[PDB]
CSV table of C-alpha atoms and ligand atoms in Angstrom, one decimal:
chain,number,residue,atom,x,y,z
A,12,UNK,CA,-47.8,-56.4,-31.1
A,13,UNK,CA,-44.8,-55.8,-28.6
A,14,UNK,CA,-42.6,-52.2,-29.2
A,15,UNK,CA,-39.1,-53.8,-29.0
A,16,UNK,CA,-39.9,-57.4,-30.7
A,17,UNK,CA,-37.8,-57.1,-34.0
A,18,UNK,CA,-38.0,-60.9,-35.8
A,19,UNK,CA,-39.3,-64.3,-35.3
A,20,UNK,CA,-38.3,-67.9,-37.3
A,21,UNK,CA,-40.3,-70.3,-37.9
A,22,UNK,CA,-38.2,-74.0,-38.3
A,23,UNK,CA,-40.7,-77.1,-39.8
A,24,UNK,CA,-39.6,-80.5,-41.7
A,25,UNK,CA,-39.9,-81.1,-45.0
A,26,UNK,CA,-43.0,-83.3,-46.0
A,27,UNK,CA,-41.5,-86.7,-46.1
A,28,UNK,CA,-41.2,-87.0,-50.0
A,29,UNK,CA,-39.9,-83.2,-50.1
A,30,UNK,CA,-37.5,-84.5,-48.1
A,31,UNK,CA,-36.4,-86.8,-50.2
A,32,UNK,CA,-35.9,-85.6,-53.6
A,33,UNK,CA,-33.8,-82.8,-52.0
A,34,UNK,CA,-30.9,-86.1,-50.4
A,35,UNK,CA,-32.0,-87.1,-54.4
A,36,UNK,CA,-31.0,-84.2,-55.8
A,37,UNK,CA,-27.7,-82.2,-53.5
A,38,UNK,CA,-26.5,-85.8,-51.9
A,39,UNK,CA,-26.1,-88.0,-56.1
A,40,UNK,CA,-24.7,-86.6,-59.4
A,41,UNK,CA,-25.7,-86.1,-62.3
A,42,UNK,CA,-23.9,-85.2,-65.8
A,43,UNK,CA,-25.2,-80.9,-66.2
A,44,UNK,CA,-26.2,-79.6,-63.2
A,45,UNK,CA,-26.2,-76.6,-65.7
A,46,UNK,CA,-29.8,-77.2,-65.7
A,47,UNK,CA,-30.9,-75.0,-62.3
A,48,UNK,CA,-30.8,-71.9,-63.9
A,49,UNK,CA,-33.7,-72.5,-66.7
A,50,UNK,CA,-35.8,-73.9,-63.8
A,51,UNK,CA,-34.7,-70.9,-61.7
A,52,UNK,CA,-35.7,-68.4,-64.6
A,53,UNK,CA,-38.5,-70.7,-65.4
A,54,UNK,CA,-40.6,-69.6,-62.0
A,55,UNK,CA,-39.1,-66.0,-62.5
A,56,UNK,CA,-41.2,-65.5,-65.6
A,57,UNK,CA,-44.5,-68.0,-63.9
A,58,UNK,CA,-44.0,-65.8,-61.5
A,59,UNK,CA,-44.3,-61.7,-63.9
A,60,UNK,CA,-47.2,-63.6,-65.8
A,61,UNK,CA,-49.2,-63.8,-63.0
A,62,UNK,CA,-48.9,-60.3,-61.6
A,63,UNK,CA,-48.9,-59.6,-65.7
A,64,UNK,CA,-52.8,-62.0,-65.6
A,65,UNK,CA,-53.6,-60.2,-63.0
A,66,UNK,CA,-53.3,-56.6,-64.4
A,67,UNK,CA,-55.9,-57.7,-66.6
A,68,UNK,CA,-59.3,-58.3,-63.7
A,69,UNK,CA,-57.7,-56.0,-61.0
A,77,UNK,CA,-44.4,-51.0,-64.4
A,78,UNK,CA,-41.2,-52.4,-66.0
A,79,UNK,CA,-41.7,-56.8,-65.3
A,80,UNK,CA,-37.8,-58.6,-65.6
A,81,UNK,CA,-35.9,-61.0,-64.6
A,82,UNK,CA,-31.8,-60.1,-63.1
A,83,UNK,CA,-29.1,-62.7,-62.7
A,84,UNK,CA,-26.7,-61.6,-59.5
A,85,UNK,CA,-23.2,-62.7,-59.7
A,86,UNK,CA,-21.4,-62.3,-55.9
A,87,UNK,CA,-17.9,-63.7,-56.6
A,88,UNK,CA,-16.8,-62.1,-52.5
A,89,UNK,CA,-20.3,-64.2,-50.9
A,90,UNK,CA,-20.3,-67.0,-53.0
A,91,UNK,CA,-23.2,-66.8,-54.0
A,92,UNK,CA,-25.3,-66.1,-57.7
A,93,UNK,CA,-29.3,-64.6,-56.8
A,94,UNK,CA,-31.8,-64.4,-59.7
A,95,UNK,CA,-34.4,-62.0,-59.1
A,96,UNK,CA,-37.8,-61.1,-60.5
A,97,UNK,CA,-40.1,-58.0,-60.0
A,98,UNK,CA,-43.3,-61.3,-59.7
A,99,UNK,CA,-46.0,-61.4,-57.6
A,100,UNK,CA,-43.8,-62.9,-54.8
A,101,UNK,CA,-44.8,-65.0,-52.5
A,102,UNK,CA,-47.4,-64.6,-48.9
A,103,UNK,CA,-46.1,-66.2,-46.1
A,104,UNK,CA,-48.6,-69.5,-46.4
A,105,UNK,CA,-47.3,-69.8,-50.5
A,106,UNK,CA,-43.5,-70.7,-49.0
A,107,UNK,CA,-44.7,-72.5,-45.9
A,108,UNK,CA,-47.0,-74.4,-47.8
A,109,UNK,CA,-45.4,-75.3,-51.9
A,110,UNK,CA,-41.9,-75.1,-50.2
A,111,UNK,CA,-41.7,-78.6,-48.4
A,112,UNK,CA,-44.9,-78.5,-45.9
A,113,UNK,CA,-47.7,-80.0,-48.9
A,114,UNK,CA,-46.8,-82.9,-51.0
A,115,UNK,CA,-47.2,-81.8,-55.1
A,116,UNK,CA,-47.5,-84.9,-56.6
A,117,UNK,CA,-44.3,-84.5,-58.7
A,118,UNK,CA,-42.4,-85.1,-55.3
A,119,UNK,CA,-42.9,-89.3,-55.9
A,120,UNK,CA,-44.0,-88.9,-59.7
A,121,UNK,CA,-40.2,-87.3,-59.9
A,122,UNK,CA,-38.2,-89.3,-58.7
A,123,UNK,CA,-40.4,-92.3,-60.2
A,124,UNK,CA,-39.7,-91.3,-63.6
A,125,UNK,CA,-35.1,-90.2,-62.5
A,126,UNK,CA,-35.9,-93.9,-61.5
A,127,UNK,CA,-37.8,-94.9,-64.9
A,128,UNK,CA,-34.9,-93.6,-67.1
A,129,UNK,CA,-35.3,-90.4,-67.2
A,130,UNK,CA,-33.7,-86.8,-67.2
A,131,UNK,CA,-32.5,-84.6,-64.5
A,132,UNK,CA,-34.2,-81.4,-67.5
A,133,UNK,CA,-37.6,-83.9,-67.1
A,134,UNK,CA,-37.7,-81.9,-63.5
A,135,UNK,CA,-40.1,-78.2,-65.1
A,136,UNK,CA,-43.2,-81.0,-65.8
A,137,UNK,CA,-42.8,-81.8,-62.3
A,138,UNK,CA,-43.5,-78.4,-60.3
A,139,UNK,CA,-40.9,-79.2,-57.7
A,140,UNK,CA,-37.6,-77.2,-60.6
A,141,UNK,CA,-37.1,-75.1,-57.3
A,142,UNK,CA,-35.5,-77.4,-55.6
A,143,UNK,CA,-32.3,-78.4,-58.8
A,144,UNK,CA,-31.0,-75.1,-57.1
A,145,UNK,CA,-30.0,-78.0,-55.1
A,146,UNK,CA,-27.6,-79.4,-57.6
A,147,UNK,CA,-24.6,-76.9,-57.2
A,148,UNK,CA,-25.6,-75.0,-53.8
A,149,UNK,CA,-25.3,-75.8,-50.4
A,150,UNK,CA,-28.0,-73.5,-49.0
A,151,UNK,CA,-30.7,-71.5,-50.6
A,152,UNK,CA,-32.9,-69.1,-49.1
A,153,UNK,CA,-35.9,-67.6,-51.4
A,154,UNK,CA,-36.7,-63.8,-49.6
A,155,UNK,CA,-40.9,-63.0,-51.0
A,156,UNK,CA,-43.0,-59.9,-51.3
A,157,UNK,CA,-46.7,-60.4,-51.9
A,158,UNK,CA,-48.9,-57.5,-52.1
A,159,UNK,CA,-50.8,-59.1,-49.8
A,160,UNK,CA,-48.5,-59.8,-47.1
A,161,UNK,CA,-45.5,-58.8,-45.2
A,162,UNK,CA,-41.6,-60.0,-46.7
A,163,UNK,CA,-40.4,-62.9,-45.3
A,164,UNK,CA,-37.3,-65.3,-45.7
A,165,UNK,CA,-37.1,-69.0,-46.5
A,166,UNK,CA,-33.9,-70.6,-46.4
A,167,UNK,CA,-33.3,-73.9,-46.7
A,168,UNK,CA,-29.3,-76.4,-46.5
A,169,UNK,CA,-30.9,-79.1,-47.1
A,170,UNK,CA,-30.9,-80.6,-43.4
A,171,UNK,CA,-34.4,-81.9,-43.3
A,172,UNK,CA,-36.1,-78.2,-41.9
A,173,UNK,CA,-36.2,-74.9,-43.9
A,174,UNK,CA,-36.8,-72.1,-41.9
A,175,UNK,CA,-39.3,-68.7,-42.5
A,176,UNK,CA,-38.0,-65.6,-40.9
A,177,UNK,CA,-40.1,-62.1,-40.2
A,178,UNK,CA,-38.6,-58.6,-42.0
A,179,UNK,CA,-39.2,-55.9,-40.2
A,183,UNK,CA,-39.1,-54.2,-49.4
A,184,UNK,CA,-40.7,-54.2,-52.6
A,185,UNK,CA,-42.8,-56.8,-54.8
A,186,UNK,CA,-41.3,-59.8,-56.1
A,187,UNK,CA,-38.4,-62.7,-55.2
A,188,UNK,CA,-35.2,-62.8,-54.6
A,189,UNK,CA,-32.9,-66.3,-55.7
A,190,UNK,CA,-29.9,-66.9,-53.3
A,191,UNK,CA,-27.4,-69.7,-54.5
A,192,UNK,CA,-24.9,-70.7,-51.9
A,193,UNK,CA,-22.8,-72.0,-54.1
A,194,UNK,CA,-20.3,-75.6,-53.9
A,195,UNK,CA,-16.9,-75.0,-53.9
A,196,UNK,CA,-16.6,-77.5,-56.8
A,197,UNK,CA,-19.4,-75.4,-58.2
A,198,UNK,CA,-17.8,-71.6,-58.4
A,199,UNK,CA,-18.6,-71.1,-62.6
A,200,UNK,CA,-22.1,-69.9,-62.3
A,201,UNK,CA,-19.8,-67.4,-60.3
A,202,UNK,CA,-18.4,-66.2,-63.8
A,203,UNK,CA,-19.7,-64.0,-65.8
A,204,UNK,CA,-18.9,-65.6,-69.9
A,205,UNK,CA,-21.1,-68.7,-68.2
A,206,UNK,CA,-23.6,-67.0,-67.3
A,207,UNK,CA,-24.3,-65.1,-70.5
A,208,UNK,CA,-23.6,-68.9,-72.5
A,209,UNK,CA,-26.3,-69.7,-70.0
A,210,UNK,CA,-29.1,-67.2,-70.3
A,211,UNK,CA,-28.4,-67.7,-74.2
A,212,UNK,CA,-28.6,-70.5,-73.9
A,213,UNK,CA,-32.7,-70.5,-73.4
A,214,UNK,CA,-33.4,-66.3,-73.1
A,215,UNK,CA,-35.4,-68.0,-76.4
A,216,UNK,CA,-38.6,-68.5,-75.4
A,217,UNK,CA,-38.6,-65.5,-72.1
A,218,UNK,CA,-40.4,-62.6,-73.0
A,219,UNK,CA,-39.3,-61.0,-70.3
A,220,UNK,CA,-35.4,-59.1,-70.3
A,221,UNK,CA,-33.5,-61.5,-68.1
A,222,UNK,CA,-30.4,-58.8,-67.0
A,223,UNK,CA,-27.0,-60.0,-65.7
A,224,UNK,CA,-26.0,-58.2,-63.7
A,225,UNK,CA,-21.7,-57.8,-63.4
A,226,UNK,CA,-20.9,-55.9,-61.0
B,12,UNK,CA,-50.4,-75.7,-36.0
B,13,UNK,CA,-48.7,-77.3,-38.6
B,14,UNK,CA,-47.3,-81.4,-38.5
B,15,UNK,CA,-44.5,-80.0,-38.9
B,16,UNK,CA,-43.8,-77.7,-37.2
B,17,UNK,CA,-40.6,-77.4,-35.2
B,18,UNK,CA,-40.3,-74.2,-32.8
B,19,UNK,CA,-39.7,-71.1,-33.5
B,20,UNK,CA,-37.4,-68.1,-31.4
B,21,UNK,CA,-38.0,-64.5,-31.1
B,22,UNK,CA,-35.8,-61.8,-30.8
B,23,UNK,CA,-36.8,-59.3,-28.5
B,24,UNK,CA,-34.6,-55.3,-28.1
B,25,UNK,CA,-34.4,-54.7,-24.2
B,26,UNK,CA,-36.3,-51.4,-22.8
B,27,UNK,CA,-33.6,-48.9,-22.7
B,28,UNK,CA,-32.9,-48.6,-19.4
B,29,UNK,CA,-32.3,-52.7,-18.9
B,30,UNK,CA,-29.5,-52.6,-21.5
B,31,UNK,CA,-27.5,-49.0,-20.5
B,32,UNK,CA,-26.9,-52.3,-17.2
B,33,UNK,CA,-26.0,-54.7,-18.8
B,34,UNK,CA,-22.8,-53.0,-20.5
B,35,UNK,CA,-22.9,-51.1,-16.8
B,36,UNK,CA,-22.7,-54.8,-16.0
B,37,UNK,CA,-21.1,-57.0,-18.3
B,38,UNK,CA,-18.5,-54.0,-19.2
B,39,UNK,CA,-17.2,-52.7,-16.6
B,40,UNK,CA,-15.0,-54.1,-13.5
B,41,UNK,CA,-16.1,-54.3,-10.2
B,42,UNK,CA,-13.6,-56.0,-7.5
B,43,UNK,CA,-15.9,-59.3,-5.8
B,44,UNK,CA,-18.1,-60.4,-8.9
B,45,UNK,CA,-18.3,-64.0,-7.1
B,46,UNK,CA,-22.1,-61.4,-5.1
B,47,UNK,CA,-23.4,-63.4,-8.4
B,48,UNK,CA,-23.5,-66.6,-6.8
B,49,UNK,CA,-25.2,-65.5,-3.9
B,50,UNK,CA,-28.2,-63.8,-6.3
B,51,UNK,CA,-28.1,-66.8,-8.0
B,52,UNK,CA,-29.3,-69.3,-4.8
B,53,UNK,CA,-31.5,-66.2,-3.8
B,54,UNK,CA,-33.1,-66.0,-7.0
B,55,UNK,CA,-34.3,-69.9,-6.6
B,56,UNK,CA,-34.9,-69.3,-3.1
B,57,UNK,CA,-37.6,-67.1,-3.5
B,58,UNK,CA,-38.8,-69.5,-6.2
B,59,UNK,CA,-39.3,-72.4,-4.2
B,60,UNK,CA,-41.4,-69.5,-1.8
B,61,UNK,CA,-43.6,-68.7,-4.4
B,62,UNK,CA,-44.5,-72.6,-4.5
B,63,UNK,CA,-44.5,-73.5,-1.5
B,64,UNK,CA,-46.7,-70.0,-0.3
B,65,UNK,CA,-49.2,-71.4,-3.7
B,66,UNK,CA,-49.3,-75.0,-1.9
B,67,UNK,CA,-50.8,-73.8,1.0
B,68,UNK,CA,-54.0,-72.2,-0.9
B,69,UNK,CA,-53.7,-74.6,-4.1
B,77,UNK,CA,-42.3,-83.2,-3.5
B,78,UNK,CA,-38.7,-81.3,-2.4
B,79,UNK,CA,-37.6,-78.2,-3.0
B,80,UNK,CA,-34.4,-78.1,-3.9
B,81,UNK,CA,-31.8,-75.8,-5.4
B,82,UNK,CA,-28.2,-77.4,-7.6
B,83,UNK,CA,-25.3,-76.3,-8.7
B,84,UNK,CA,-24.0,-77.9,-11.7
B,85,UNK,CA,-20.4,-76.1,-13.1
B,86,UNK,CA,-19.4,-77.9,-16.3
B,87,UNK,CA,-15.7,-77.8,-17.4
B,88,UNK,CA,-16.3,-79.6,-20.3
B,89,UNK,CA,-17.9,-76.7,-21.6
B,90,UNK,CA,-17.2,-73.9,-19.9
B,91,UNK,CA,-20.5,-73.2,-18.1
B,92,UNK,CA,-22.1,-73.7,-14.6
B,93,UNK,CA,-25.5,-74.0,-14.2
B,94,UNK,CA,-27.9,-73.6,-10.6
B,95,UNK,CA,-31.2,-74.6,-10.8
B,96,UNK,CA,-34.5,-75.4,-8.3
B,97,UNK,CA,-37.7,-77.4,-9.0
B,98,UNK,CA,-39.7,-73.6,-8.0
B,99,UNK,CA,-42.3,-72.2,-9.7
B,100,UNK,CA,-40.8,-71.0,-12.5
B,101,UNK,CA,-41.6,-68.7,-15.5
B,102,UNK,CA,-44.6,-68.4,-18.8
B,103,UNK,CA,-43.7,-67.1,-21.8
B,104,UNK,CA,-45.0,-63.6,-20.8
B,105,UNK,CA,-42.2,-63.3,-17.3
B,106,UNK,CA,-39.2,-64.6,-19.7
B,107,UNK,CA,-40.8,-61.2,-21.9
B,108,UNK,CA,-42.0,-59.4,-19.3
B,109,UNK,CA,-39.9,-59.5,-16.1
B,110,UNK,CA,-36.5,-60.3,-18.6
B,111,UNK,CA,-36.5,-57.8,-21.4
B,112,UNK,CA,-39.5,-55.4,-21.7
B,113,UNK,CA,-40.8,-53.3,-18.8
B,114,UNK,CA,-38.6,-51.5,-17.0
B,115,UNK,CA,-38.2,-51.8,-13.5
B,116,UNK,CA,-37.5,-49.4,-11.4
B,117,UNK,CA,-35.1,-50.5,-9.5
B,118,UNK,CA,-33.0,-50.5,-13.2
B,119,UNK,CA,-32.8,-46.7,-12.3
B,120,UNK,CA,-32.3,-46.9,-8.9
B,121,UNK,CA,-29.4,-49.3,-8.8
B,122,UNK,CA,-28.0,-47.5,-11.6
B,123,UNK,CA,-28.0,-43.9,-9.2
B,124,UNK,CA,-27.0,-45.5,-6.2
B,125,UNK,CA,-23.7,-47.3,-7.9
B,126,UNK,CA,-23.0,-43.5,-9.1
B,127,UNK,CA,-24.0,-42.0,-5.6
B,128,UNK,CA,-21.5,-45.1,-4.6
B,129,UNK,CA,-23.1,-47.8,-3.6
B,130,UNK,CA,-21.7,-50.8,-4.2
B,131,UNK,CA,-22.2,-53.9,-7.0
B,132,UNK,CA,-23.8,-56.2,-3.8
B,133,UNK,CA,-26.6,-53.5,-3.0
B,134,UNK,CA,-27.8,-55.3,-7.0
B,135,UNK,CA,-29.9,-57.6,-4.1
B,136,UNK,CA,-32.7,-54.2,-2.9
B,137,UNK,CA,-33.2,-52.6,-6.1
B,138,UNK,CA,-34.9,-56.7,-8.0
B,139,UNK,CA,-31.9,-56.7,-11.0
B,140,UNK,CA,-29.6,-59.1,-9.3
B,141,UNK,CA,-30.2,-61.7,-11.5
B,142,UNK,CA,-28.3,-59.6,-14.8
B,143,UNK,CA,-25.1,-60.0,-11.9
B,144,UNK,CA,-24.5,-63.2,-13.9
B,145,UNK,CA,-23.3,-60.3,-16.5
B,146,UNK,CA,-19.7,-60.6,-14.0
B,147,UNK,CA,-18.5,-63.2,-15.1
B,148,UNK,CA,-20.8,-64.9,-18.2
B,149,UNK,CA,-21.0,-63.5,-20.9
B,150,UNK,CA,-24.0,-65.6,-22.2
B,151,UNK,CA,-27.2,-66.4,-20.2
B,152,UNK,CA,-29.7,-69.0,-20.9
B,153,UNK,CA,-32.6,-69.6,-18.7
B,154,UNK,CA,-35.1,-72.7,-19.8
B,155,UNK,CA,-38.1,-72.0,-17.4
B,156,UNK,CA,-41.6,-73.8,-17.0
B,157,UNK,CA,-44.1,-73.0,-14.8
B,158,UNK,CA,-47.4,-74.7,-15.0
B,159,UNK,CA,-50.1,-72.9,-16.7
B,160,UNK,CA,-47.1,-73.2,-20.3
B,161,UNK,CA,-45.0,-75.3,-22.1
B,162,UNK,CA,-41.1,-74.8,-21.9
B,163,UNK,CA,-39.5,-71.9,-23.0
B,164,UNK,CA,-35.7,-70.3,-23.2
B,165,UNK,CA,-34.6,-67.1,-22.6
B,166,UNK,CA,-31.3,-66.4,-23.6
B,167,UNK,CA,-29.1,-63.5,-24.6
B,168,UNK,CA,-24.4,-62.3,-24.8
B,169,UNK,CA,-25.7,-58.5,-23.1
B,170,UNK,CA,-26.1,-57.3,-27.5
B,171,UNK,CA,-28.6,-55.1,-26.3
B,172,UNK,CA,-30.5,-58.1,-26.9
B,173,UNK,CA,-32.8,-62.0,-26.2
B,174,UNK,CA,-34.4,-64.5,-27.5
B,175,UNK,CA,-37.6,-67.1,-27.1
B,176,UNK,CA,-36.9,-69.7,-28.0
B,177,UNK,CA,-40.3,-73.5,-27.7
B,178,UNK,CA,-39.0,-76.5,-26.4
B,179,UNK,CA,-41.2,-78.4,-28.6
B,183,UNK,CA,-39.7,-80.0,-19.1
B,184,UNK,CA,-40.4,-80.3,-15.3
B,185,UNK,CA,-41.8,-77.5,-12.9
B,186,UNK,CA,-39.2,-75.0,-12.3
B,187,UNK,CA,-35.6,-72.8,-13.6
B,188,UNK,CA,-32.3,-73.5,-14.9
B,189,UNK,CA,-30.5,-70.7,-16.1
B,190,UNK,CA,-26.7,-71.8,-17.2
B,191,UNK,CA,-24.2,-69.3,-17.2
B,192,UNK,CA,-21.3,-69.0,-20.3
B,193,UNK,CA,-18.5,-68.2,-18.3
B,194,UNK,CA,-15.5,-64.7,-19.2
B,195,UNK,CA,-12.0,-66.3,-19.7
B,196,UNK,CA,-10.5,-65.2,-17.0
B,197,UNK,CA,-14.0,-66.1,-14.4
B,198,UNK,CA,-12.5,-69.7,-14.9
B,199,UNK,CA,-12.1,-70.0,-10.4
B,200,UNK,CA,-16.9,-70.7,-10.4
B,201,UNK,CA,-16.2,-74.3,-12.8
B,202,UNK,CA,-13.5,-75.2,-9.7
B,203,UNK,CA,-15.8,-77.0,-6.7
B,204,UNK,CA,-13.5,-76.6,-3.8
B,205,UNK,CA,-14.1,-72.4,-4.8
B,206,UNK,CA,-18.3,-73.4,-5.8
B,207,UNK,CA,-18.4,-75.5,-2.5
B,208,UNK,CA,-16.3,-72.0,-0.2
B,209,UNK,CA,-19.0,-69.6,-1.9
B,210,UNK,CA,-22.4,-71.3,-1.3
B,211,UNK,CA,-20.9,-72.4,2.8
B,212,UNK,CA,-20.8,-68.2,2.8
B,213,UNK,CA,-24.6,-67.6,2.1
B,214,UNK,CA,-26.0,-71.3,3.0
B,215,UNK,CA,-26.9,-69.7,6.0
B,216,UNK,CA,-29.7,-67.8,5.3
B,217,UNK,CA,-31.4,-70.3,3.0
B,218,UNK,CA,-34.0,-72.7,3.7
B,219,UNK,CA,-33.2,-75.0,1.1
B,220,UNK,CA,-30.7,-77.6,0.7
B,221,UNK,CA,-28.3,-76.4,-1.9
B,222,UNK,CA,-26.7,-79.1,-3.3
B,223,UNK,CA,-23.3,-79.0,-5.5
B,224,UNK,CA,-22.7,-81.0,-8.4
B,225,UNK,CA,-18.9,-82.6,-8.3
B,226,UNK,CA,-19.4,-84.3,-11.3
C,1,D1S,C1,-39.0,-70.2,-54.8
C,1,D1S,O1,-40.3,-70.6,-56.7
C,1,D1S,C2,-41.5,-70.3,-57.3
C,1,D1S,C3,-42.2,-70.6,-55.9
C,1,D1S,C4,-42.7,-72.2,-56.1
C,1,D1S,C5,-41.7,-73.4,-57.2
C,1,D1S,C6,-41.6,-75.0,-57.1
C,1,D1S,C7,-42.3,-75.3,-55.6
C,1,D1S,C8,-41.8,-75.8,-58.0
C,1,D1S,O2,-40.3,-76.3,-57.8
C,1,D1S,N1,-41.6,-75.5,-59.8
C,1,D1S,C9,-43.0,-74.0,-59.4
C,1,D1S,C10,-43.1,-73.5,-61.0
C,1,D1S,C11,-44.6,-72.8,-61.1
C,1,D1S,O3,-43.6,-72.0,-62.0
C,1,D1S,C12,-45.6,-72.8,-60.4
C,1,D1S,N2,-45.9,-72.0,-60.6
C,1,D1S,C13,-48.3,-72.6,-61.9
C,1,D1S,C14,-47.0,-73.1,-63.2
C,1,D1S,C15,-47.9,-75.0,-63.3
C,1,D1S,N3,-47.2,-75.5,-63.3
C,1,D1S,C16,-46.4,-75.2,-64.4
C,1,D1S,C17,-46.4,-76.1,-62.7
C,1,D1S,C18,-46.3,-74.2,-59.3
C,1,D1S,C19,-46.5,-74.0,-58.5
C,1,D1S,C20,-46.9,-73.1,-57.3
C,1,D1S,C21,-45.6,-72.9,-56.2
C,1,D1S,C22,-46.2,-72.3,-58.1
C,1,D1S,C23,-47.0,-71.0,-57.2
C,1,D1S,O4,-47.8,-71.3,-55.2
C,1,D1S,C24,-48.6,-70.9,-55.0
C,1,D1S,C25,-47.0,-69.5,-56.9
C,1,D1S,O5,-47.9,-69.2,-58.1
C,1,D1S,C26,-45.9,-68.6,-57.5
C,1,D1S,C27,-46.0,-67.8,-59.2
C,1,D1S,C28,-44.4,-68.8,-58.0
C,1,D1S,C29,-43.5,-69.3,-58.2
C,1,D1S,C30,-43.4,-70.1,-59.5
C,1,D1S,C31,-42.0,-68.6,-57.6
C,1,D1S,O6,-40.9,-68.8,-58.4
C,1,D1S,C32,-40.6,-67.4,-58.5
C,1,D1S,N4,-40.0,-66.5,-58.2
C,1,D1S,O7,-41.8,-66.3,-57.4
C,1,D1S,C33,-44.2,-74.7,-58.8
C,1,D1S,O8,-44.4,-75.5,-58.2
C,2,D1S,C1,-34.1,-65.2,-13.2
C,2,D1S,O1,-34.0,-65.1,-12.2
C,2,D1S,C2,-36.0,-65.8,-11.4
C,2,D1S,C3,-36.2,-64.1,-13.0
C,2,D1S,C4,-36.0,-63.0,-12.2
C,2,D1S,C5,-34.9,-62.5,-12.1
C,2,D1S,C6,-35.1,-60.5,-12.2
C,2,D1S,C7,-35.0,-60.0,-13.5
C,2,D1S,C8,-34.2,-60.0,-10.5
C,2,D1S,O2,-33.3,-59.6,-10.8
C,2,D1S,N1,-35.2,-59.6,-9.4
C,2,D1S,C9,-36.0,-61.4,-8.8
C,2,D1S,C10,-36.3,-60.9,-7.8
C,2,D1S,C11,-37.8,-61.7,-7.7
C,2,D1S,O3,-37.1,-62.5,-7.1
C,2,D1S,C12,-38.2,-61.3,-7.6
C,2,D1S,N2,-39.6,-61.5,-6.7
C,2,D1S,C13,-39.8,-60.9,-6.1
C,2,D1S,C14,-39.4,-61.0,-4.5
C,2,D1S,C15,-39.4,-59.8,-3.2
C,2,D1S,N3,-38.3,-58.9,-4.5
C,2,D1S,C16,-37.6,-59.6,-3.5
C,2,D1S,C17,-37.9,-58.9,-5.5
C,2,D1S,C18,-38.6,-60.3,-8.8
C,2,D1S,C19,-39.9,-59.6,-9.3
C,2,D1S,C20,-40.5,-60.5,-10.5
C,2,D1S,C21,-38.9,-60.8,-11.8
C,2,D1S,C22,-40.1,-62.4,-10.3
C,2,D1S,C23,-40.4,-63.4,-10.8
C,2,D1S,O4,-41.8,-63.0,-12.0
C,2,D1S,C24,-42.4,-62.3,-11.5
C,2,D1S,C25,-41.0,-63.9,-10.8
C,2,D1S,O5,-41.8,-64.9,-9.4
C,2,D1S,C26,-40.1,-65.1,-9.4
C,2,D1S,C27,-40.8,-66.6,-8.4
C,2,D1S,C28,-38.4,-66.1,-10.5
C,2,D1S,C29,-38.4,-65.5,-10.7
C,2,D1S,C30,-36.9,-65.5,-8.6
C,2,D1S,C31,-36.4,-66.2,-11.3
C,2,D1S,O6,-34.8,-66.4,-10.6
C,2,D1S,C32,-35.4,-68.5,-11.0
C,2,D1S,N4,-35.1,-68.3,-9.9
C,2,D1S,O7,-36.6,-68.9,-10.9
C,2,D1S,C33,-37.2,-60.1,-9.4
C,2,D1S,O8,-37.3,-59.0,-10.6
């Protein structure tokens, strides 16, 4: 409304069970943390599917894997449906999914971190290798927003005063620098690219 | 509205002339920067007057000077009328007062920084000795808010999810550490306390 208004950031606490899951993920040892990439690519593929199916009723859909050695970040990007402010607030922190508790119960009953996907909480596997995660998204029905969390009990929602889609940036943990290496990413992408219908472009830089 | 909502910060650009004045104040040499204290005490006294006069139609009103050697800050506090969010946004950055340009014109015509008070912009003299200023206020008609600026072209407005009044905290410049000394403050307060009707309490700490 104000001419001089530049932007806004809102802080939200995580729903109790989401907070527990994030602590369990970021501050607990697991043997194969590399499963995070399969989860992010799978989410990107689902976002591309949502807009592709919307086209039946109501451009090349693709997924990009962008390592950045200088800022020590790994980004998974898509030109899928995108998320509104409400989608980010409601589905990425404040409303508990049945899968949050159910995944923690499955791990407790001897399950594996690779099972995360069936519980609708696979996004949070990013915290196996990252100490901070940034979600920048644009849906056709809303302005673009930036979600951010360092798994400290809260997340932020910031305005951007972007083309349709989502960019997920992972600030990597000191000992998880192997996911910046092009050879390592090419291998990881090939390991599960067999069942992704969309093109997965690794940006060499 | 949301149960998990914690707080919000909004960024605003300064109105062009306010931005010019702040650059002129913070990044220009003046011989007697000590005039800032007289200005802050005078503003506090005016805020106490506004509520005292409101009492005629519709507690001890006093002013406190709080030095803090550890955080390198000087605070001027009052239990005056206080400011709403709108008061902070409109009168502390986005709406140009006629006094903004007129004070810069008076300095240009040979005026002195001590004249600032007659132009309704005396608050900005805080930047003669401070690199950052924080305004925390509570008015009876609104929740309490925090205004903040480092004279970088913008200011912030942050929610506090406080008793009626205002607290102005100055983060002092490296060479302006003399305004933390109790002896120096006692002198400065005495220099103009003759015309302030309210009690001025220096908190020794
Ligand atoms: C940031 O990553 C994603 C956002 C949340 C991710 C969460 C918490 C997670 O860990 N897993 C989920 C994976 C899903 O695939 C999925 N979709 C339903 C599939 C049915 N089963 C299989 C779940 C949901 C339900 C719900 C959140 C979906 C979304 O808001 C309604 C959007 O419709 C969807 C298009 C946005 C995304 C998939 C985001 O990815 C990108 N790149 O956009 C999940 O919960
Ligand atoms: C943060 O400090 C103050 C806020 C802004 C200060 C500005 C920009 C400044 O540099 N100088 C001003 C000094 C004034 O005295 C003054 N009041 C009218 C007196 C008539 N002439 C003499 C001006 C105004 C007009 C207007 C802003 C007033 C306020 O919003 C309507 C409130 O009524 C008032 C009670 C709040 C304060 C005085 C604040 O202090 C404390 N401690 O609360 C000034 O502009």
